[PDB]
UniProtKB/Swiss-Prot annotation, chain A:
Residues 7-8 are annotated as: Integrin-binding motif. This is Spike protein S1. It comes from Severe acute respiratory syndrome coronavirus 2 (2019-nCoV). Binds to host ACE2. RBD also interacts with the N-linked glycan on 'Asn-90' of ACE2. Cleavage of S generates a polybasic C-terminal sequence on S1 that binds to host Neuropilin-1 (NRP1) and Neuropilin-2 (NRP2) receptors. Interacts with host integrin alpha-5/beta-1 (ITGA5:ITGB1) and with ACE2 in complex with integrin alpha-5/beta-1 (ITGA5:ITGB1). May interact via cytoplasmic c-terminus with M protein. May interact (via N-terminus) with host bilirubin and biliverdin, thereby preventing antibody binding to the SARS-CoV-2 spike NTD via an allosteric mechanism. Attaches the virion to the cell membrane by interacting with host receptor, initiating the infection. The major receptor is host ACE2. When S2/S2' has been cleaved, binding to the receptor triggers direct fusion at the cell membrane. When S2/S2' has not been cleaved, binding to the receptor results in internalization of the virus by endocytosis using host TFRC and GRM2 and leading to fusion of the virion membrane with the host endosomal membrane. Alternatively, may use NRP1/NRP2 and integrin as entry receptors. It comes from the Viruses.
Amino acid sequence: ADSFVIRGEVRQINIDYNKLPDDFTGCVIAWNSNKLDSKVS
Amino acid sequence: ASVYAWNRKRISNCVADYSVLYNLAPFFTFKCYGVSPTKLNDLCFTNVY
């Protein structure tokens, strides 16, 4: 289980900027960071 | 332009650099088909609209 936050790049995982493509075998569990890891923005 | 009166635009002879474009504020997305975002820097085109 990896732990990263991207911009939105949500169509892909720009991100050659640190190689984890769609045909890599796995599941994507994802949600918005604007409710917990945020501010006004 | 408006949707019904959209302006026609053709791009002429150009040495294109796309790596400076994808991080500009109006050019964040590339949700489409038929071209690749990591391959446009190596392709040649007859014209671009």
